[PDB]
């Protein structure tokens with residue numbers, strides 16, 4: 001193909017991109033795309049680049065943005081991205097993360113468990129009704145996206161109406177946030193972000209009118225109290241960005257977890273065990289299918305960086321192929337074997353041999369929602385396993401095409417009565 005970004009976006013590799021990634025890792029581990037964007041596919045390089053973000057790598061400066069992203073000036077989505085905390089280093093990053101971190105702590109995620117349980121039981125009850133009638137159910141549409149959408153809305157300060165009203169817009173924006181995005185895709189993303197901006201403009205007034213115990217209300221109060229703690233552009237970027245991160249990747253992990261259950265029935269037993277056993281299954285789900293193969297966030301080299309025979313020049317945009325690092329045999333031996341024991345009894349995300357899964361990133365931009373995602377999976381997956389021992393696929397799952405995300409359009413299932 002033209003470059004690795006073209007290969008990953010190609011239909012031929014949409015079903016199982018990991019053979020291409022194995023090819024890339026083995027033949028061009030420090031890949032230089034046609035546009036000059038680099039892509040690291042080895043776990044060791046990826047881990048280094050993530051951990052070294054702060055000095056060796058930084059988010060784009062104003063100069064970098066104009067140089068590397070000449071459209072950013074006429075792209076609503078790129079300009080919104082430029083002011084998210086994922087593009088920043090301390091002290092700016094510290095200030096912005098400090099404003100949102102409380103809502104995502106272990107303690108605050110615990111407070112969401114009653115809602116997670118109630119949504120899980122409510123939706124699975126309706127789903128069990130249809131399945132028992134012999135119906136085919138699109139589990140992605142009626143559960144996988146529904147649970148994280150509703151839980152995120154409660155945390156964030158959105159009504160259930162708003163989040164369903166924007167799911168379509170959110171997914172079109174997401175697809176525009178990658179180098180290979182077509183002019184058509186980026187235009188639609190820009191239009192959808194103005195819509196999202198329109199919604200938040202209204203939501204902002206509502207939460208200024210009636211503050212409540214949600215994230216949007218605290219950001220607005222922090223901004224309204226003092227926009228040098230959170231500027232106008234930082235506020236809208238934060239609202240936009242957290243919405244983009246708030247459920248799509250979590251739903252993808254629920255989808256992939258269900259497929260793992262069906263594909264590896266001998267490993268479903270892990271979901272019947274104690275908390276540590278359930279968590280271990282979910283960590284292996286996260287290693288096996290990172291929902292973002294690489295991250296939309298650019299990392300700009302602050303030095304000329306020589307890696308083996310390849311030199312990344314100062315100022316170059318470097319991306320990290322998280323999904324390839326997760327299946328890099330140097331970090332995870334026999335990497336295509338699905339085995340929850342890799343993460344059983346260890347620190348979250350850490351293998352028994354001391355190698356981290358990369359699906360949540362690492363370093364200063366380590367995923368803020370990691371506990372939120374893990375806990376939703378930990379609550380719902382054992383209930384799904386116990387309720388449908390005879391779940392089977394009813395046709396092939398339909399993936400949503402994308403250059404970098406691993407989401408689904410459908411996960412059709414039925415009950416096997418035999």
Ligand code: HEM
Pocket residue numbers: 085086087097242245246247249250253290291292295296297322358359360361362364365366367368369370372373
């Ligand atoms: C399975 C689910 C999820 C996955 C796989 C995932 C993935 C990631 C990745 C790879 C990064 C690092 C990006 C980079 O360093 O270039 C990240 C950061 C982040 N994620 Fe998650 N995410 C998930 C769920 C969530 C949720 C539910 C939220 C809710 C708000 C969220 C919010 C964020 C934020 C705000 C950051 C930026 C943190 C910072 O820059 O300090 N994510 N995520």
Ligand SMILES: C=C1C[C@@]23CC[C@H]4[C@@](C)(CCC[C@@]4(C)C(=O)O)[C@@H]2CC[C@@H]1C3
Pocket residue numbers: 081084085086174177238240241242244245249292294295296297
């Ligand atoms: C506030 C924010 C939430 C954030 C988390 C990470 C997430 C994005 C970048 C959207 C695309 C997928 C993913 C996983 C990525 O890193 O590619 C999202 C939007 C902007 C920033 C970073």
